[model samples]
Target: HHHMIYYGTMFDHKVRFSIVRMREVVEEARNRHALSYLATVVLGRALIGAALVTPWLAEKERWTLDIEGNGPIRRVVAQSTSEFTVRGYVANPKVELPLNEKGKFDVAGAIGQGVLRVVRDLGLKTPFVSQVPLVSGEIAEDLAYYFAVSEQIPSAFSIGVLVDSDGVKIAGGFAVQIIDRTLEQEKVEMIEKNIKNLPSISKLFQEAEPLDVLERIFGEKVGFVETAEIKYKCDCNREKAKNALLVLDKKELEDMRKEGKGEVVCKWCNTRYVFSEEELEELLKFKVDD
Candidate 1:
């Protein structure tokens, strides 16, 4: 079995791009009949990206990546926190877009041109928001440009997700940042040259472990610090969802009762909650009808 790998000294200076295998969550989704082919692919890669990026955030910070594309798979969102819990979902689960001319899932087409938003909730009064236009609709390329332009970080990102006839085989990716903020132009060019010369992420991951693939991004100068096992954990639950409904007006509560129940679905995980009429009445009874 594969485990998350950690390396190097924490005091040392180096940037890491790592991978997270979401095979378990993906398998659960498949077993629950909650994932279509494209949905599984999107969810797997999105979770992998979350695992890669979460390590970089501060202890109190959380990050969210929302891709509202103009493709068959219209929306993809990934959220991860310092607590190591992350979950995401995609819109249009049953879409079956034609593969691109290259015979790959038309990820670009599924995620058509739109805005990409990166939100960092730092437990501050206001979160940091960064927006960029979707470039090429390929997530790696778009994220590369986002870092270069918006964040002013010279980084290379590669994510690969493979789905087979059975289900998702591998889901992982990495992001490498140049620590030498003032890296010379020549060095920058060399770094970019190395990244371009490498094979796609899935090809590397298929042949090697996540650490191996991540180490390759920084060439020989790379060293690891710590590795973590990542998984999909959602914050949404029936209690939380119910408390949210408690804030709703009495009319809405009565409507739910008349309709037999209030169906609530968490956008983050697609988990459905049904509050039956009796449950609604009990909740409504506690309200003063103000």
Candidate 2:
């Protein structure tokens, strides 16, 4: 199914929420990186986190989520644009670990101790960045903690990915934020209880779409406010790659030409740009003589 994000308000406008079903995004990352089940689970969660967070950005703005950890997985990064496109990679996509005691994927074990860094860019001179220690290596819990502690916004986040031999079976998540001044104490407690009793996000999506999930959470008080399409897209191109080569010194270009050609590969999309020897020569003259 195509990826989609649903935005809504529930609990009589006290809570603002967004839900995203990102199977295609996860599948694209899996196919591109040949990620292990654990990596798929970890990176998929990060991608969903990025998706939920970026919807508020203006057109062409974006945010990136970076997880650096001591686990074998090393690092995980996901970038989400205002358009709701997300792309991510795991530093060690092939790493795998034993299942947790719960007989589920050991996402926390795979992620280990780390820090979560969020950078938001609105096409401004300086992007806003926030960092917090990992509360739990699982992306959802860590993000919830980030909202609670770092941003000081009471929020609930749930993200999941189901993977098998073929690739991602299903992947989705939801983020619920209590708007400041919009919630009374009693309403806040009720919302908290509802979040506590809600089923796993992935299971909810298996049964119904995002709006239905909202109804289940808020008992029909929820109204869909908006919707946006999301996808796994990479914004890399030949011109960008060529500009990278312009930084090379004459000796570096000569060495590359001696090797017959140079190739630039995009980690985000796995697209490769090959520069022929003749092309490299032209580049060498364009840069050195100037």
Candidate 3:
């Protein structure tokens, strides 16, 4: 199944920190699998994170952020492209922990204190890696802090995932960038007060009112621009995985054959490929006997 994708550009206005609340996105991602609460939260954050950062990346360069936490949820990696393709995955997805006193998924507790690594692969000689300590563990603040410290780009990001007994009703977000615009002391105070008073991102998006959302954030000064849809697309095939398998040594092929069932799983999309014994034998034909 394909997931819907959305897009919007911010000129003078930048993104807000509203994406910190992503319970709804988690519910949507969890619909793909029966994962634990922590796993759902991690996956949700990764999906929204891709949408949040990709639009800001340079056209020639693609970025991948790897979130490795110290808690039960080991890793969360998200990748984005110039054409707006985004994908991600979470390790150890079956962590069923109780919610915190606030009745929210314990994402911070599940993530613990760890490192957020951003890799910019511009199809260049070496990928640029940016590392930052996870301050809040709640996806949004950590990423905002990452941009401020590593990239030195001031911005706001918000992503929310709403989960209920039914399924993922809403799973999209908006990223506002504050370019060449710095808030004054009074304006900053007003923005902070308004942000605290505004509804959570999931609630705003779930309400199906982006215009009102902008109004809530920017008041009467919100300028209307273009909007685009977001989706979930995984470009994976058996042939692709087969070619990757060719890179392995002959001994590895033999070991895979010994296992009786050789398989490869796509990390980003979670697609599994099963190779028959006969298929393995053919691949082994290229091997030399010593």
Candidate 4:
């Protein structure tokens, strides 16, 4: 009933470590989008990856991750808040694909080549925006490449989403980054060893709790420093939909009235709101009758 992410420091506080568990979040995403197995896997990995990369933020701070590809799955977008709530959708949720030779979901084949864009809303007039090529369409490596290239931080990510006939069984991943430039050899070697010994993120999450996995990840006893709840949540409402409809001129509203109704769908959550002819009249006159 709960999905959580833990943030902490490891290797004498030289590297930052974070882990996330989000089976429920991913499954809800699949259900809401009516995603195929391939689309489900892509969105799941993208969701958890977005959670792992987030840092502490203020009330209005959040980040957005966008993946636009040439394969059947055209695009997937994930936006997360500082409060640990994320909402997103795949551009094409009904995509189908055969498994790879590894007998695994062919995430890369379905993703093909694409660009990963990151927009961070800090406490500034404009949010930070960066884009990079999808070095490997498998989600994890592309995020790592983003760090190495765009952020200039040496980082590693291992995100996994395991699905059975019952749907998403386990979903989560780990993020480790070298935050300190001048690191001791012992610490660096230890970090490398930890990466080498890290088990499959999905398998390990299924086998143990998140805290246990964190200890195993850094090969050192680490405390759950900043644990928080994370979930799949969308912020959409009828008022917002009306405002969006306002973008069309008054004549469009009249046409919608003549057509009998106006319907608006939230692509992020797939929630549809219908406005009757009466409501359309309220909109055209720019007033509402109580």
Candidate 5:
């Protein structure tokens, strides 16, 4: 399936739905981070969940989803832009666990008890911060609860990642949100019934796209609003790294110079930026100009 998001209103515009297929996005992350099966699945769900919410952001706006738990996975941070570019990593990529009673990866067990934080940096006066105690350590359920309790927008999420011994096979999910004040009681009941009767989101996407999946849920009345492709991408660069160091104490740079060179590693993509002694001198000079 194409790596794209299909979004529109359903049930006579009383609800909104955004469905994303992010196989390549998750596969790229797995290859970059060398994540184990459970880690890959957990991080992939976070990435897709964040991407699904990107539609709420304005152009050039961005947001981050941080999952910090006491479990072995520790923390998982995923960031996405309004354009659907996403990249993220698991704090402990080697986390592995036995299957749960359902013979599924123990994602909830791996994520333990913790808080789910959503930080929206929309070029505003300050970033909007919302924190909610995790209802279920499973990424999708927790996000659904976050939307419901924190944002007061009743939402449902179906995020999943299919991984094997070889690697990730498919990674994606769907987000359904009821348009506030427009949903009728019968429509809400109908949606709940449909969701209860539906199959796994990953299984539904195995041979189809987002549009097809929405069709199964909304029938012929589904309206298409817009389509956008998403990819696994990072925007970190040498200039950004240089600017990042300007806030450090001058003595730190001097000490690094004495040591030979300075290395800046991006936590998002694991890209390393190396600065020679001469380059460090120039950066310090630029800092002086600032």
Candidate 6:
């Protein structure tokens, strides 16, 4: 019942891989956003996608993933630290559509044409941001496309989630990044073919854990490098929430004061910060005389 992420290698260290099992995380997200089945799939995929990319960040750094389009679900965003903590929400978690022709959730149909952006904040002047056109509107494919285009690293990412009215039952995913620079085409082809024949990710995780994914791909040749725990944590607090409200002009703050109280909620964790009328008045006093 413990959900966590696993990091390791494949093919006698010829490649690097990361696997994550996060059923509980997805369920918590559903409860947080009251997400529908379709939103559950898209958000879970994006969240897991963020987990897999944590290897590219320093321990104190962060990753912000944005999947935005002109569909019912206008945007989906997930934030994760390199330390493996993640939180996300949907702009329209209640939107749902009929299943696709394949009897599958219409994930792409709901997201429409969009762009996937990955932002890296290194505690510097400006965060590094990279974006690419969305391919299929599926998080997994778009993530792989990013690595393939930006990193030039041969990588394969497989992710799946089982979701329904009861919420997400199980979720897991893995990434395989070929490391050897000049490895033979034959061996590379073999790895590619092996992945093709492996069981689908949704079915594979139902009866297994994270490491089993590597075992299936590389048998006894896989090596466990380092494992880290991941969670649905939000770094939001009352002071920060007040600062968020500061974005509004003085007139808007006065309107809120007349209302007697103001409520601010963190979308990531659904934590509400209520400011009393007096508190709002004090906050306004701290503002510059503009």
Among the numbered candidates, top TM-score falls to 2
Clashing pairs in 1: 7-224, 17-175, 70-112, 71-110, 71-112, 72-110
TM-score of each: 0.88, 0.94, 0.84, 0.92, 0.90, 0.93
Segments of candidate 3 deviating more than 4 angstroms: 1-34, 181-186
lDDT (10s digit) by residue, model 6, range 243-277: 98887788888889999988898989788899999
lDDT tens readout by residue for model 3, 1-290: 12333334333454332222233434535755566655765677667787666555687666787889788888887777666656677787687668889887788878777988889988779999999998788887788788777866665566666555666545555554444445455555555555567666666775646566655665444544443333445678999988777778988889989888688888766678999878888778855532
For 52-169, candidate 5 gives per-residue lDDT tens digits of: 9877787788889999999999999999898778889888999998999999888898889999999988898998889999998888889999998888889889888998877777
lDDT of 4 at 189: 75
What lDDT would each prediction earn against the true structure?
0.70, 0.84, 0.65, 0.84, 0.84, 0.81
Query: Model 3 — which ten-residue stretch has the worst lDDT?
Result: 16-25
Stretches off by above 4 angstroms in model 2 are: none
Worst 10 residues of 5 by lDDT: 215-224
Residues 1-290 of candidate 2 have per-residue lDDT tens digits of: 45888886666676788888878888888888888888889999999899997667777887889999899999999999987788989889899899999888988888888899988788889998999999989898888888888777789898889888878888898898876745778777776787788878767667876777777666555755788888888989999999888987789889999999999988887788999999999998898678
| lDDT (tens digit, per residue) of candidate 4 on 1-290 | 34888898765677898888888998999998888888888999999888886654557778888888898888889888887888888988988888999888998988788899988887898999999989989998898988888877778898999987899988898898888767787777777687778778766776878777767766767864888888888889999999877777888888999999999999988889899999898888783232
TM-score of candidate 3 relative to the true fold? 0.84
lDDT of 4 at 106: 90
Among residues 3 or more apart in sequence or in different chains, the pairs in candidate 5 whose N, CA or C atoms overlap within 3 Å are: none
Rank order (by TM-score, best first): 2, 6, 4, 5, 1, 3
Q: Return whichever of 2 and 3 wins on lDDT.
A: 2
- Report model 1's TM-score to 2 decimal places: 0.88
lDDT for each residue of candidate 1 in 1-290, tens digit (9 for 90 to 100): 23232333211353434456556655554444366776676666666666667767788677888889777788988788886666777777777777779887777777887978889999889999999998887788777777878888766777777778877676666666655475556656665776787777667766876555545555553554566666566778999999888999889999989988898888776688998888999889888754
Backbone atom clashes (below 3 Å) for every candidate: 6, 0, 25, 0, 0, 0
Using TM-score as the measure, name the better of candidate 1 and candidate 4: 4
* Overall local distance difference test of candidate 3: 0.65
lDDT of model 3, residue 8 = 47
Q: Which residue ranges in model 5 land beyond 4 Å of their true spot?
A: 219-221, 281-290
| Cα lDDT, model 4, residue 227 | 81
